[PDB]
A = this chain, B = another copy of it.
Amino acid sequence: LNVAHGLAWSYYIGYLRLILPGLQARIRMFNQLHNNMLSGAGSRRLYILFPLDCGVPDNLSVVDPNIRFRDMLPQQNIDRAGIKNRVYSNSVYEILENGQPAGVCILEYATPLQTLFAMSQDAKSREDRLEQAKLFCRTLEEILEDVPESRNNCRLIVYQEPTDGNSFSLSQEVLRHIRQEE
């Protein structure tokens, strides 16, 4: 349709383009402080949760008994070529599998999906929201494909959280992605 394009571009321009080139330096800072806790597959990329249903939690953090908050990435004052950085909120979680920590992961939501959710809650549909969300995703995927540094430092985790039933597990989904990486 229309808004997906704008959402993808602004989310790149105003966020991903800004945070991705400084991420590894901040992972390094985090690992120096926290005895290499950010180690193992899936631990050194920004994983962006992209629920096509657009269910981003209000408070933006992952809320899930099997995805346990541990810590946030520290900040880097100055970027690689001497330009001052803004500040970024990035959270590191441990993924549980049967009560046992199975991985550590920098996880967050693709925040603009909230905008799509809001649009579908005004008196002036959900299937349109889904199509918009998909288009938002593939447009973002195309953009990242054009910058090879970015694609190295982040992965999109695209799924659909059903509105009811107990079939879907986000933690297993995140594990599924990391373990299948090649």
Contact = CB atoms under 8 A, between A and B. Distances in A.
Interface of A: 2-3, 5-7, 9-10, 13-14, 17-18, 56, 58-61, 69, 72, 75, 84, 86-89, 91, 111-112, 114-119, 121-122, 124
A128 to B, nearest CB: 11
Nearest to A3: B3
Contact of A115 (B75, B88, B115): B115
B122 A2 contact: yes
B72 A118 contact: no
Contact of A89 (B69, B72, B87, B112): B87
A72 B87 contact: yes
Contact of A6 (B75, B88, B91, B119): B119
Given A2-B124, A18-B59, A18-B60, A10 B86 contact: no
Nearest to A69: B84
Nearest to A56: B14
